[PDB]
Design a protein around this ligand. Structure first.
Ligand SMILES: [Cl-]
Ligand SMILES: [K+]
Ligand SMILES: [K+]
Lengths: 265, 308, 308
């Protein structure tokens, strides 16, 4: 099933429940009439895309705009491939499956995602892996891979899962409940503000918080397990765990159960 | 009725084994030396489930490739009557023989249907500083481990360990021989053969038992008594089941995670003992039974004739 | 004014040890191998008295000259809270790790004021066939032994074993060091020094403890919890009792039949560790105390300065 984007989007678009499972049941003529527009004037799937449908769990959106909100949200089946850029809330509340994006992503990508894998070959927006307004948690069990560079508040109020970022902006892992974030390269200023639990590993790092204390350079069994887990998934950050690391305990402002690893020298 | 294997008489009996709860754990250390120290202290004081807490043994030493840790490890089995009694014994032993040993780490050894809490209970020694982590292993399965803070570092312990159903214990075959010194060697190379089978162990000291566990007794409510029939000091009188040439008897008890492993462990012991048996004075080989109605699994030596 | 020995800082504390019930037994076999197999399975699963039944260890290996049997033996100690709990643990362990082991024989190890029935209780496994014999030893004292008939032959067991009064356990000193691999070696050569003292053992695996048993707990009613002060993962925050150069802590726990042996066992470990300590990055050596009011015996490191 392929959706060929006809042209530029005049308004923001909500692609929720436009999952290959839902699309299979619908007829090709009936599926075209599904409205995805935000505004009162609205927009139907036929107005935006050239719909080619087949009874399959695989979906490919050819062409993407930064105005594609909630793309792949609540996805429980199959896969969605977006050859282009996307908007906010990539796979909001994704249950399971795979969701790959060629371009960059908007803010709040990965919110409330339970299972499956969200891959952004481009850059992630602000609050990538972070919780939305009034949200209990951000990433909640799903694996989030950003080959490019994430913005501010990566993994904000993250509860579960794993984030594999290339680069990260300021205030990464803020208000973190739990989880694992391995950014291969630079990490912005003030990481892990309010961190409760979790593991943050980065190659470079900016200025650290006063409530973070250094533990030293410990050879831990968990690091060995996390390394083999990244090796098995083909993660580029698997090499970051090869050498001896410098450790810091989670933000002491809250219960200091989180941690931060940075290369020794 | 009489059977002869490798020129040595073998009684046409069966070994009466029982159904038991069994589980396995993999304990790793930075060196194989301390991996073994950790397991040796855990397996000690575990020769029977009725008197000792459980029946424990080391299945195999693991190389850094055969382990989920990547560090040299030990696969160590534990058997108990009830899945609750087994959980109780594993919690005690892992908590005070594994956790205490420096640089160790506990993982689930075997796959099974019922679940046993391990890391989730020792986590409470962490006094609230322990954290839990979920990671996919080399096979692709999500596993949950606990990180207990300790003096040397972190004691990493997997939350749950699985207990295999249908683990069989009590499979035994005993040897009759002329002299203790020589006949011990027959049993020694017999246990070395049995240890090799995966998932099977021999809980008794060196695998060998010298006290013949007999069901019942002469006086009052005897639950266990010595096997006067196979005692050389009670020879010559009615009720002694050993010939005048015999002067020493030794028993070999095998426990395994799978019933087939009990039979294959017995077979390997039966053959290895008889091949060299004539040289060291092995008179005959029999198996221990209780009457047939106590234990579900019967391992007849007549089925163990085929070479391994 | 904190003491510094051999270039290594030594904390000006004391080790809080407790009074405990202690006894010793000598187990002999035909070969030194099987005497050790018997000793190793009995000592296992006995690292603390609170969780495990008792605290056990092997004092020293005995030659055929040092034994009442005339056969190579092993002197093995056992410690318990109460003389009744000590009696219960010895009966269980000798009954199922010594009696079961082939070619063994159990004798009383140490002399003491209180009496513990040992052979007189295992004799009931004989099912009425066991006999008692009274014979004078090489010193001229009349001793009573039991002869339990078993498969391999007879399990000879002395009727009574003596329990010495004033056995002390819990004497401990812990090492702070830069790296687990190297500092383990410091603790390893420390236990080898401590083992040598007669009448003293180290119950934990290989003599070393990695989990700092701290009295109390943060929440609810906890009997034991991890020692967050000496945990390297909880560094940098208030309440961490170790400097930034330190990254690993290892504890050594010593039990002995006599109070002086605990101090002398501590002294040898303290000196052996520091002599080689600078080579392996040993930062400092301190001792674990509970406040002074829990344990009667206080072993201050200020009195252990004199060379052995
Ligand atoms: Cl939206
Ligand atoms: K084996
Ligand atoms: K010694």
């Amino acid at each position: 099933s392929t959706l060929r984007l006809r042209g530029d989007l005049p308004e923001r678009v909500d692609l929720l429940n436009i999952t290959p499972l839902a699309l299979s049941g619908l007829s090709e003529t009936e599926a075209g009439k599904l409205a995805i527009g935000t505004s009162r004037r609205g927009l139907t799937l036929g107005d935006v895309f050239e719909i080619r449908l087949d009874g399959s769990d695989s979906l490919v959106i050819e062409g993407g705009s930064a105005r594609l909100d909630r793309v792949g949200a609540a996805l429980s089946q199959g896969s969605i491939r977006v050859e282009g850029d996307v908007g906010q809330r990539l796979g909001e509340g994704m249950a399971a499956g795979t969701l790959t994006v060629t371009g960059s992503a908007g803010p709040y990508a990965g919110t409330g995602a339970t299972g499956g894998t969200i891959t952004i070959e481009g850059d992630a927006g602000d609050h990538a892996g972070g919780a939305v307004y009034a949200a209990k948690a951000g990433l909640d069990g799903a694996t989030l891979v950003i080959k490019g560079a994430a913005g501010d508040h990566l993994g904000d109020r993250m509860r579960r899962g794993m984030i594999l970022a290339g680069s990260a902006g300021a205030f990464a892992a803020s208000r973190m409940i739990a989880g694992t974030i391995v950014v291969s390269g630079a990490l912005g200023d003030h990481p892990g503000y309010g961190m409760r639990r979790g593991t943050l590993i980065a190659g470079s790092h900016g200025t650290l918080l006063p409530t973070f204390v250094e533990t030293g350079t410990p050879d831990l069994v968990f690091v060995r397990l996390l390394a083999q887990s990244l090796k098995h998934l083909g993660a580029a950050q698997a090499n970051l765990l090869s050498g001896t690391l410098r450790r810091y305990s989670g933000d002491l402002a809250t219960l200091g159960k989180g941690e931060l690893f940075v290369p020794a020298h | 009725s009489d059977f002869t294997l490798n020129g040595i008489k073998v009684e046409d009996t069966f070994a009466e084994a029982f159904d038991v709860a069994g589980t396995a754990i993999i304990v790793t250390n930075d060196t194989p030396k301390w991996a073994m120290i950790a397991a040796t202290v855990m397996t000690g004081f575990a020769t029977s489930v009725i008197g000792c807490g459980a029946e424990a043994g080391i299945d195999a030493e693991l190389s850094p490739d055969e382990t989920p840790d990547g560090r040299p490890g030990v696969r160590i089995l534990l058997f108990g009557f009830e899945p609750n009694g087994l959980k109780d014994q594993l919690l005690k032993r892992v908590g005070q023989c594994i956790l205490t040993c420096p640089g160790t780490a506990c993982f689930a050894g075997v796959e099974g249907p019922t679940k046993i809490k391990l890391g989730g209970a020792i986590r409470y020694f962490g006094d609230g500083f322990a954290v839990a982590k979920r990671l996919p292993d080399h096979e692709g399965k999500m596993r949950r481990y606990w990180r207990i803070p300790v003096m040397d570092g972190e004691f990493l312990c997997e939350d749950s360990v699985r207990a295999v159903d249908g683990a069989v214990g009590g499979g035994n075959l005993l040897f009759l021989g002329r002299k203790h010194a020589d006949t011990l060697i027959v049993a020694e190379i017999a246990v070395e053969a049995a240890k090799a089978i995966p998932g099977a162990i021999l809980p008794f000291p060196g695998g060998i038992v010298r006290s013949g566990s007999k069901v019942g007794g002469r006086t009052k409510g005897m639950m266990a008594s010595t096997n006067d029939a196979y005692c050389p000091t009670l020879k010559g009188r009615a009720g002694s089941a050993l010939p005048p040439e015999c002067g020493v008897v030794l028993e070999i008890v095998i426990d395994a995670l799978t019933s087939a492993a009990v039979a294959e462990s017995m077979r390997a012991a039966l053959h290895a003992a008889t091949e060299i048996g004539a040289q060291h004075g092995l008179v005959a080989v029999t198996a221990g039974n209780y009457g047939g109605n106590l234990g579900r699994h019967h391992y007849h030596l007549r089925d163990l004739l085929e070479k391994p």
